[model samples]
Target: ADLEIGREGEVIQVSKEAFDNWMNRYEAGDTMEVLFPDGHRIECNLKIDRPKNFMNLTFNQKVRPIQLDDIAAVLYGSKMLRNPCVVGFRLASSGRAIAFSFKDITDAQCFVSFLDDEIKKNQE
Candidate 1:
């Protein structure tokens, strides 16, 4: 695991194999505790659901499936899923740390700011 999370927080890299393992149990209320390369320990929970209809699934003209072990930044909320909002993380490469509703894109800055505050609280 050549993974490292910076003081400011970087995502943990996951191999395809690792990503699948997490995805398989993503909806089972499984949790993972990871010690990043910088030695910051972060815990993440998984959520299960079909991709919401609001996202721009047509982005890049490809409907990409969320893969296992893909490094991501996790946010706590049910902004998209609405059910208890158990857990949500977006692929680090996709530029989404906070999973917002499809309409959230209209005010994405606000959503990101909100989640940033939550992340800060978690750090505290």
Candidate 2:
């Protein structure tokens, strides 16, 4: 019997844009797509978080999740080791590559674990 996000009976910070976009997009649950101001399309889902702090209503679109099986090679490139702001995922050589720039080094570590079966990380 509870649906409203304000059920905590107190005020909290949440992105209104994210809230609205998530609302409209979720209705078409069978398939997911996002439209940009430039009129492009992408497929991804939203993972909105509710934390106990006053954060701004920023416009954080999303980063798509790639399947583990699709990626054949991993890049612990010089960029990554140097603590760059990007993560590279690949599918079959370099025919199709997906790069996601996540915030902070903590996410970087968590991301590495996903592909850490055996990363010979001396150089790329």
Candidate 3:
């Protein structure tokens, strides 16, 4: 399993609406996200997704990260799926973390601010 469990890194997650309409916005964090229970959507070897409704797909074992839907968002503006959001540990030695729409991604409130003052981003 090259996907290491430690060493946090950048994560580019797609909002449910972003996947559905090919657009990602900060206006809707948890409110706009679409959900599907008992669903199965897998990708980047991650699975067992949460139940609060995430793209109605399981980032843990199914869905496998939408291509046509989200793909358009990323391709459309190169902004929605780019610039990096969310957070996760490195995948392997080379350093590659998988991004899952866990909870949020506020530009000025990035979760990275939680880390050491000198070691992370989102600094006040």
Candidate 4:
């Protein structure tokens, strides 16, 4: 229980226990909130349907998957001197981007690395 997920400049925090529990639900095909750059968030079930093809992000009981090929870029780490550490991506589906911050830098790094690898695998 060492992982945590939260938003930038917010008091909201998800503890390691809660995150693990939620991940369990995610694995079971349940919905969870995914934050976007525009401050809009959605509780959606997500799945990597096919490598390098599309990722299913179910919203409002409808399955709308985002194409992996539509991903313009995946940016991670602290982009500015005083910015909180983050991992984000640009997608063609929406003009707005999405990003996530973790309480642990190592966790953030690991997530970013894993995401990069997945994207690479899809591209290959």
* CA-only RMSD, every prediction: 16.7, 17.4, 14.5, 8.1
Evaluated with TM-score, which candidate comes out highest? Answer: 4
Work out the TM-score per prediction: 0.24, 0.36, 0.21, 0.50
- lDDT per residue for candidate 3 within 1-124, as digits (tens), equals 0223223322224344444322233213222222223443233322212232123333334443321111111111111233233333222233433333333344212322212222322122
lDDT of 1 by residue, 1-124 (tens): 1223244443322255544554455444344333334645444443443233111122233433443333235543321223222224565457653332322222223333433544454445
TM-score of 1: 0.24
lDDT of 4 by residue, 23-115 (tens): 354345553456665777666666554445666777777886677666655665321331334556667558656665544554445435545
Which of 3 and 4 is the better model by TM-score?
4
- Residue-pair clashes per prediction, in order, are 4, 0, 11, 0
Q: Indicate the TM-score of model 2.
A: 0.36
Clash pairs of candidate 2? none
Q: How does candidate 3 score on lDDT?
A: 0.27
What stretches of model 3 exceed 4 Å from their correct place? Answer: 1-80, 83-94, 115-124
> Which sequence of candidate numbers ranks them by lDDT, best first?
4, 2, 1, 3
Cand. 4 Cα-lDDT: 0.54
What is the TM-score of candidate 4?
Answer: 0.50
